[PDB]
């Protein structure tokens, strides 16, 4: 029976078949999630790059790595942003079923530095379970905050 797990540790350490990449449209190295995605994962970068609100699969050996590009609310309205963020775990949900995946391994997408400055845990983990709640994978959400990884616990305990 799927569930949704939450650890508080490096994505790049995960133990899930696949991993999603908090990716930028360039499709280049970044920093974050990305810094240590690309340090372990590098030959997942070639041609990478995916537009805002889209999800791109490519394969290391056979690991597979999912580039999710999630809005920056810097740049976007509250109502365009909500809805590229929406998409981008549309997009990811899509992947995860095509590779036939038993597990994943997903960041609370456009909650850093494309959050806009503000806290957007409740609204990236409800369009994370809206997009997943279709799939039949195992999902372990990976945070790096304390305050984060009780408050993702919490919304887990609450659906079941
Ligand atoms: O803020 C984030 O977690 C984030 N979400 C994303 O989808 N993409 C990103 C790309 C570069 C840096 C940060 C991010």
Same mark, same amino acid.
């Given at each position: +029976?799927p569930?949704?797990?939450?650890? @508080?540790?490096?994505? +790049? =350490?995960?133990?899930?078949?696949?991993? /999603? $990449?908090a990716? $930028?449209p @360039?499709?280049l190295?970044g920093?974050?999630?990305?810094? %240590?995605?690309?340090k372990?994962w590098?030959? #997942?970068?070639?041609?990478?790059?995916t537009?805002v609100g !889209?999800? =791109?699969? /490519?394969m290391?050996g056979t690991?597979?790595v999912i580039? %999710?590009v *999630?809005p920056?609310f810097?740049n976007? #309205?509250e109502?365009? *942003?909500?809805?590229?963020?929406? %998409?981008?775990?549309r997009?990811?949900?899509?992947? /995860? !079923?095509r &590779?036939? /995946?038993?597990?994943?391994?997903?960041?609370? &997408? #456009?909650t850093?530095?494309? #959050?806009?400055?503000k806290?957007?845990?409740?609204?990236? &983990?409800?369009?994370?379970? !809206?997009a997943?709640?279709? !799939?039949?994978?195992?999902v372990?959400?990976?945070?790096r905050?304390?305050?984060?990884? =009780?408050?993702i616990?919490?919304?887990?305990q609450? @659906?079941?």
């Open positions: +029976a569930s949704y797990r939450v650890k @508080r540790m490096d994505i +790049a =350490k995960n133990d899930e078949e696949c991993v /999603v $990449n990716a $930028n @360039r499709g190295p920093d974050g999630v990305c810094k %240590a995605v690309y372990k590098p030959e #997942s970068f070639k041609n990478s790059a537009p !889209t999800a =791109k699969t /490519v290391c690991y597979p580039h %999710a *999630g920056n810097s976007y #309205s109502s365009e *942003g909500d809805r590229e963020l929406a %998409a981008a775990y997009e990811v949900a899509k992947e /995860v !079923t &590779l036939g /995946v038993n597990s994943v391994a997903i960041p609370l &997408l #456009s850093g530095v494309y #959050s806009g400055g806290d957007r845990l409740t609204q990236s &983990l409800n369009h994370l379970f !809206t997943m709640d279709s !799939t039949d994978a195992d372990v959400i990976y945070c905050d304390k305050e984060w990884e =009780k408050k616990s919490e919304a887990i609450m @659906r079941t």
